[PDB]
Subunit: 260 residues, 4 copies
């Protein structure tokens, strides 16, 4: 066999046109998988989706999806199974991170973050239960964060709640889905260089990198490669994990402990 | 002079008329604190609140509160500060735990659990920010659970998400509130004997106890005594903790590891 | 009386200085009988006199080398002979010398494991009989954020030892539960000790700037949590690792420390 | 451009002749790496070399090694560098797990477990520092366990201490080694089907399997495939992780929570 073969997989990546989701979609496309790249409006980035279509032997398409809308989740799952004939890997990756301190955070700001990041995760997994189950080797991969499960950051207590909520959901979902052969795992990115963050300059970037033992920010494909590994047949006994990808950022006790 | 003195405290306990919340209110009442016992409908259990009033030197009262309603939270905090002249301890305890497997869980079932358990926790803390800050020794204590942060239980993936969400919220909120002198901590109860559980008979209770190294189910005052400790001046350096109270239930590797 | 400790008999290892002395002090104030253990007879008579007047319990000093199992047995016997009981043990003794991974000698690694890990195991083992006889026995381990939570270049052996204590706890809590003994751990962050005061206020303020609470902790912060865990009221709490750090381990980066 | 290419790696696997260590060595051999398998006894060394030499394009050697002995560790690293011209992956996998209840455990029983399981790990990594650093892409992978970091098991408090100690070591070692390009990670196997468990018979194995959501015990290659992933260039931003491979064993709250 080829080790870590993903060429027979059919993958859904929510929030797949940008940032971390795009890194995840890129890796699956290079591995030869069918990949559905979902977005609120896929046509805004259709050249990205077409480019992914050139990277491997699988079929790559865009799908429209509002993750917070349970009907939209159900339509997208249906579309993907009609498209590929299967859906055996789900990367529930979509999420938002607007800023609000506790003394000003409105009920609407709190609800928006919980609707997208928590309900959107639950609805995405629920919509895909039947094809995940039918596959015999189903894989659920959640994009969480260090913020919430591990760290705090003033202005992001709702974001942190939402990212920790994904893990609480996972610890039960993994049990519900295990007898059907489905694993359920989470990836917790640290500081990842995205398209947004690049247009801020080498002084702001390397400033952030100074707190990271590895000495640089991560990339979207760092997240993508772990997701790819988790989706393989070879990872079928790994479930309920929360794996941090952060260049060692959360380890140092204090600024003086960052560098030997 | 007196170690762990709480006789000068003014405490709000949400969901305080029943179960764990009643255990927390009871301990604070015995310790001589002012205690506001909050409930969806306090009059249903006014005899409980009256009895608490006899346990110590503090003023004990009922307060109506729908934690999922941000206006209700604001009204209750105003009522409590008017009543006591202060509000320096908040036990954000209210929570529900209806059952729903992932294959049947409706958007409405998911939303209700997140609204009460997560939003209710956030709104309660937010409503109390001004008096917590004014005290200089503010205390926030969250009632979470082992289910979600530690364990899973088929039928409670939404409950687990909500209980883990409380911790993600805490890890940022503790940072936001620390310079104002406020600590933010959580208690994670295991299997606690409440009224409901009592009715189900000694043989069903003894059956659950067999998985617990300590050999019995906990009581609501086990939770209350930890909350009381966390509220003391003596606990002013403890923040952001998630402390499990479970008689060692989460420790054994398997059934044969439960007893030596 | 809520949280009554006046009927307790407590052994505190490394009890004559810093965190250990903070633990001993709180138990003494609470009215418990307290035995402080150390290697130095001079530090013993001095701390014993200090603690002796704080409450209604008796205070003794005990010579102890925690890395020696025979010395541990002697200490438990000495404590039981003096108090008639031994129902709380604070396994607190530990060392923290620096050694980078590329220079760390077998002697440096072995010493840290012998004192911090083996010393913890031998202390608990020596106390098993009186802990069991009490019906309400309490074991409290002094661990650290370093190892279980954080890393710090120079302290990989120390971190290994502090994490080892928790691995030990998670099983010991189960073996001892049916005897009525709880087994818990406290993980101090940055606590103000004598060696830190000597660094001066600029150095201390610099450390405090990474801590949300805005200051370093106190030995009695550890003492008060140990006292709570020893009460009858904490009888359903076992196998916990509780961090006491003013939120130091929470911020994501320097910019996240202050709102 | 092969994703997850390991064909240029030179790998030392301590305790590599049996059980989990052999599963690790086998996966790396299949992926085309040079593999040195180490054991305390010289007995199995020639045979494992002929057997694994067959599996891929790399070379396989057997190394006699007492991990508790610093000089033996230094000799092993030298042997590997002489044979392969490099040493860029070390799997510090050797460990022992004899039983000893707290009330009978001798100084000798405690010391032996700490010497092999903890000191053996430190000395292995230390002996490999120079070639790990020279490679530019060094990888350290520790075999820990759920027992210690997560669970308790009467009779294994020394074992659990040793397995947790590896992780305390890791959280600092990962910081010290990061600027040299070396990642340091740990795998925590749950219940893996080994020879000894097979010899107990199917009823015993089935009994164990009923506590596992996945419905079966794992295999040594489950550990080996994760080790292989961690060793890739693609996992270069992952450090300080403790990843559990257990089929969901540590998730259920109680026996009734294992199956939905
Ligand atoms: K293609
Ligand atoms: K009263
Ligand atoms: K006295
Ligand atoms: K070969």
């Amino acid at each position: 066999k080829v080790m870590f073969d993903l060429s027979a997989r059919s993958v859904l990546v929510t929030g797949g046109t940008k940032g971390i989701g795009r890194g995840i979609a890129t890796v699956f496309a290079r591995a030869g998988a069918n990949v559905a790249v979902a977005a609120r409006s896929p046509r805004e980035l259709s050249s990205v989706t077409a480019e992914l279509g050139e990277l491997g032997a699988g079929n790559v398409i865009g799908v429209r999806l509002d993750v917070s809308d349970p009907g939209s989740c159900a339509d997208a799952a249906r579309t993907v199974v009609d498209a590929f004939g299967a859906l055996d890997v789900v990367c529930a990756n979509a999420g938002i991170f607007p800023e609000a301190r506790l003394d000003t955070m409105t009920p609407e700001q709190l609800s928006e973050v919980l609707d997208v990041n928590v309900k959107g995760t639950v609805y995405t997994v629920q919509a895909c239960l039947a094809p995940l189950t039918a596959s015999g080797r189903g894989r659920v991969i959640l994009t969480s964060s260090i913020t919430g499960p591990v760290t705090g950051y003033p202005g992001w207590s709702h974001y942190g709640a939402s990212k920790a909520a994904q893990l609480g959901f996972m610890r039960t979902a993994a049990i519900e889905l295990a007898p059907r052969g489905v694993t359920v795992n989470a990836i917790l990115p640290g500081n990842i260089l995205t398209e947004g963050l690049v247009d801020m300059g080498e002084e702001y970037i390397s400033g952030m990198a100074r707190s990271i033992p590895m000495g640089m920010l991560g990339s979207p494909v760092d997240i993508g490669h772990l997701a790819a590994f988790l989706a393989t047949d070879e990872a079928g006994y790994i479930t309920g994990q929360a794996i941090v990808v952060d260049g060692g950022q959360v380890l140092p006790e204090s600024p003086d402990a960052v560098n030997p």
